[PDB]
């Protein structure tokens, strides 16, 4: 039932879209172009800010390994969630990564819809979200796209993983 007429792929470019981002400096809007041209981009998506494989796992991991990731020739880390931006600042704050990495909100899923991760996680009351995913991204083109299959599982797409493809 989904739309999967497009299912971003290995090759492929990233569409252009914009992620509102609350930063210490304040509320800020990081468009596809500024994160990923010229770069070399470790892009993470999660189900939900605050659920518990996002927080107790997926993200302290990328957290715990962003030094040792930095240091293999990334430029930045961002990770991406269908949630608003205030709680998107919010667990930015409450996880500790609050500068370390980007908490980008694709609130409407504009960015998920448009490569065509959209995931329909209702019964656990998070509705419409992103699949956990993580991709390494090279001036805006896909090199490396570990899409998790259960979103309780966050191995394939965990920092760990990815350091490994470094």
């Not at 252009?16 to 981002?21: G, Q, R």
């Not at 269908?82 to 704050?93: F, I, P």
């Not at 996880?95 to 448009?114: E, P, Q, R, V």
Request: with cysteine; aromatic share 8%.
């Amino acid at each position: 039932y989904f739309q999967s007429m497009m299912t971003i792929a290995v090759g492929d470019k990233l569409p252009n879209a914009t992620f509102k981002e609350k930063t210490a400096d304040g509320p800020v809007e990081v468009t596809t172009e500024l994160l990923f041209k010229g770069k070399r981009v470790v892009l993470f998506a999660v189900p939900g800010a605050f659920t518990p494989t996002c927080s107790l796992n997926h993200l302290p991991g990328y957290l715990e390994n962003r030094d040792a990731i930095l240091a293999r020739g990334v430029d930045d880390i961002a990770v991406v969630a269908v949630n608003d931006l205030h709680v998107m600042g919010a667990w930015a704050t409450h996880s500790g990564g609050m500068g370390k990495i980007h908490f980008l909100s694709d609130w409407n899923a504009a960015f998920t819809k448009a490569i065509g991760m959209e995931i329909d996680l209702s019964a656990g009351t998070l509705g419409i979200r992103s699949k956990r995913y993580s991709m390494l991204v090279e001036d805006g083109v896909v090199k490396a796209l570990n899409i998790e299959e259960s979103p309780g599982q966050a191995t394939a797409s965990g920092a760990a993983a990815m350091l490994e493809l470094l």
